Design an enzyme around this catalytic site. Structure first.
Site, PDB file in Angstrom:
ATOM      1  N   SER A  19       1.290  -5.499   0.426  1.00 49.27           N
ATOM      2  CA  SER A  19       2.106  -4.400   0.655  1.00 49.27           C
ATOM      3  C   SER A  19       3.452  -4.515   0.248  1.00 49.27           C
ATOM      4  CB  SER A  19       2.336  -4.662   2.215  1.00 49.27           C
ATOM      5  OG  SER A  19       2.872  -5.591   2.837  1.00 49.27           O
ATOM      6  N   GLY A  20       4.131  -3.337   0.351  1.00 46.85           N
ATOM      7  CA  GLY A  20       5.750  -3.427   0.344  1.00 46.85           C
ATOM      8  C   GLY A  20       6.271  -1.954   0.434  1.00 46.85           C
ATOM      9  N   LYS A  24       0.933   0.112   1.231  1.00 49.99           N
ATOM     10  CA  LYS A  24       0.041  -0.859   1.475  1.00 49.99           C
ATOM     11  C   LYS A  24      -1.270  -0.784   0.636  1.00 49.99           C
ATOM     12  CE  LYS A  24       0.967  -1.178   6.586  1.00 49.99           C
ATOM     13  NZ  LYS A  24       0.728  -1.069   7.748  1.00 49.99           N
ATOM     14  N   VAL A  25      -1.965  -1.876   0.352  1.00 48.73           N
ATOM     15  CA  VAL A  25      -3.160  -1.973  -0.394  1.00 48.73           C
ATOM     16  C   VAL A  25      -4.362  -2.814   0.461  1.00 48.73           C
ATOM     17  CG1 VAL A  25      -4.314  -2.589  -2.546  1.00 48.73           C
ATOM     18  CG2 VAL A  25      -2.079  -2.347  -2.597  1.00 48.73           C
ATOM     19  N   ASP A 133       6.613  -2.709 -17.687  1.00 45.52           N
ATOM     20  CA  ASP A 133       6.715  -3.791 -16.747  1.00 45.52           C
ATOM     21  C   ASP A 133       5.664  -4.961 -17.011  1.00 45.52           C
ATOM     22  OD1 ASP A 133       8.515  -5.004 -14.836  1.00 45.52           O
ATOM     23  OD2 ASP A 133       7.260  -4.614 -13.193  1.00 45.52           O
TER      24      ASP A 133
HETATM   25  C1  LIG Z   1      -0.017  -5.499  -4.240  1.00 44.55           C
HETATM   26  C2  LIG Z   1       0.092  -4.197  -4.998  1.00 44.55           C
HETATM   27  C3  LIG Z   1      -0.476  -4.337  -6.393  1.00 44.55           C
HETATM   28  N1  LIG Z   1      -2.298  -3.968  -6.439  1.00 44.55           N
HETATM   29  C4  LIG Z   1      -2.689  -2.559  -6.269  1.00 44.55           C
HETATM   30  O1  LIG Z   1      -2.219  -1.742  -6.026  1.00 44.55           O
HETATM   31  C5  LIG Z   1      -4.177  -2.783  -6.462  1.00 44.55           C
HETATM   32  C6  LIG Z   1      -4.944  -1.510  -6.639  1.00 44.55           C
HETATM   33  C7  LIG Z   1      -6.158  -1.555  -6.705  1.00 44.55           C
HETATM   34  C8  LIG Z   1      -6.952  -2.586  -6.781  1.00 44.55           C
HETATM   35  N2  LIG Z   1      -8.379  -3.075  -6.508  1.00 44.55           N
HETATM   36  N3  LIG Z   1      -8.473  -4.187  -6.636  1.00 44.55           N
HETATM   37  C9  LIG Z   1      -7.548  -5.029  -6.105  1.00 44.55           C
HETATM   38  C10 LIG Z   1      -7.107  -6.340  -6.266  1.00 44.55           C
HETATM   39  C11 LIG Z   1      -8.349  -6.880  -5.424  1.00 44.55           C
HETATM   40  C12 LIG Z   1      -8.096  -8.289  -5.085  1.00 44.55           C
HETATM   41  C13 LIG Z   1      -6.931  -9.136  -5.673  1.00 44.55           C
HETATM   42  O2  LIG Z   1      -6.959 -10.469  -5.219  1.00 44.55           O
HETATM   43  C14 LIG Z   1      -7.340 -10.550  -3.986  1.00 44.55           C
HETATM   44  C15 LIG Z   1      -6.539 -10.365  -3.011  1.00 44.55           C
HETATM   45  C16 LIG Z   1      -5.128 -11.087  -2.965  1.00 44.55           C
HETATM   46  N4  LIG Z   1      -5.009 -12.233  -3.360  1.00 44.55           N
HETATM   47  C17 LIG Z   1      -3.949 -13.024  -3.193  1.00 44.55           C
HETATM   48  C18 LIG Z   1      -6.288 -12.842  -4.242  1.00 44.55           C
HETATM   49  C19 LIG Z   1      -7.725 -12.380  -3.911  1.00 44.55           C
HETATM   50  C20 LIG Z   1      -5.990  -8.270  -6.023  1.00 44.55           C
HETATM   51  C21 LIG Z   1      -6.017  -7.050  -6.571  1.00 44.55           C
HETATM   52  C22 LIG Z   1      -6.309  -3.930  -6.511  1.00 44.55           C
HETATM   53  C23 LIG Z   1      -4.997  -3.782  -6.417  1.00 44.55           C
HETATM   54  C24 LIG Z   1       0.184  -3.707  -7.424  1.00 44.55           C
HETATM   55  C25 LIG Z   1      -0.238  -3.982  -8.718  1.00 44.55           C
HETATM   56  C26 LIG Z   1       0.299  -4.021  -9.954  1.00 44.55           C
HETATM   57  C27 LIG Z   1       1.189  -2.599 -10.019  1.00 44.55           C
HETATM   58  C28 LIG Z   1       1.451  -1.999  -8.682  1.00 44.55           C
HETATM   59  C29 LIG Z   1       0.962  -2.668  -7.608  1.00 44.55           C
HETATM   60 CL1  LIG Z   1       1.575  -1.514  -6.000  1.00 44.55          CL
END
Ligand SMILES: CC[C@@H](NC(=O)c1ccc2[nH]nc(-c3ccc(OC4CCN(C)CC4)cc3)c2c1)c1ccccc1Cl
EC number: 2.7.12.1
Length: 260
Positions: A19-20, A24-25, A133
């Site tokens: 989130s931020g 949110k995701v 980025d």
């Molecule tokens: C935090 C915002 C960030 N991520 C996303 O926007 C985003 C979009 C689509 C996605 N599909 N799957 C993921 C995802 C799934 C699992 C995961 O790891 C899990 C959960 C968290 N932890 C600590 C480990 C286990 C991580 C991602 C997903 C994420 C974002 C990232 C890059 C650029 C912009 C943004 Cl808003």
């Protein structure tokens, strides 16, 4: 049991994974119990540029679906003056969190990952997007394949769970007063990390000194010797401070490291 409807389909929230700000995701399930990620943005409190940055990212994400599977999938979305919901493929973990588990990395998997990254970045460069980025957190591990998440256009949220200037190319810094080569440098730092367990400038605690060290050609980036000499060559070509001298992506595609 909080749900979400998107284009007439109900999703059940498993957990919030990031989130931020206005956004949110979440990991969610459809009625068939298939897993998805849902990215939510609250536009009611969103500013103006957040809005346009978010329209541009969505259009590009959509356009690029057909061209590469190294780009994360957008299955559907909903936009109103009030909100944005984006239904995307769900991954297992992002590449940044996985690298923090501090375990051994299979040199074969490191190169398979490197390949995926290059393919994804090459794809966005072909459409004229330079990410700017690039970080490990921009990459998602889905079935042993790295997939690029964002384009660097919309602003970011931050990971949630129940438990950096390091990638900045020297050009960007001198620019204080853009090339696809900028992504190569950042990609280079990421491979550097999967190789030596740290980023090139990581050691420097003072951010002013560190920004200087990145732009100072008298500051020598260490490249310890390693069993794979071609990987070492990749690192050195990615990490040249002069963007004109620095290797391009299509060259990286033809390099012995990924082709042999
Ligand atoms: C935090 C915002 C960030 N991520 C996303 O926007 C985003 C979009 C689509 C996605 N599909 N799957 C993921 C995802 C799934 C699992 C995961 O790891 C899990 C959960 C968290 N932890 C600590 C480990 C286990 C991580 C991602 C997903 C994420 C974002 C990232 C890059 C650029 C912009 C943004 Cl808003």
């Amino acid at each position: 049991n909080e749900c979400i409807s998107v284009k007439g389909r109900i999703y059940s929230i498993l957990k919030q994974i990031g989130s931020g700000g206005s956004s949110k995701v979440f990991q969610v399930l459809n009625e068939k119990k298939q897993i998805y990620a849902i990215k939510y943005v609250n536009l009611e409190e969103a500013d103006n540029q957040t809005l346009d940055s978010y329209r541009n990212e969505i259009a590009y994400l959509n356009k690029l679906q057909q061209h590469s599977d190294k780009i994360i999938r957008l299955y559907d979305y909903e936009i109103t003056d009030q909100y944005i919901y984006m239904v995307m493929e769900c991954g297992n973990i992002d590449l940044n969190s996985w690298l923090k588990k501090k375990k051994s990395i299979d040199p074969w998997e490191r190169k398979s990952y490197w390949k995926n990254m290059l393919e994804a970045v090459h794809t966005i460069h072909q459409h004229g997007i330079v990410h700017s980025d690039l970080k490990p957190a921009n990459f998602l591990i889905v079935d042993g394949m790295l997939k690029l998440i964002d384009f660097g256009i919309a602003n970011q949220m931050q990971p949630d769970t129940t438990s950096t200037v390091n990638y900045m190319p020297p050009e960007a810094i001198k620019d204080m007063s853009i090339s696809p080569k900028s992504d190569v440098w950042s990609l280079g730092c990421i491979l550097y990390y999967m190789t030596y367990g740290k980023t090139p400038f990581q050691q420097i605690i003072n951010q002013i000194s560190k920004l200087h060290a990145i732009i100072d050609p008298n500051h020598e980036i260490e490249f310890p010797d390693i069993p794979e000499k071609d990987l070492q060559d990749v690192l050195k070509c990615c990490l040249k401070r002069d963007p004109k001298q620095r290797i391009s992506i299509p060259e990286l595609l033809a390099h012995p490291y990924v082709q042999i």
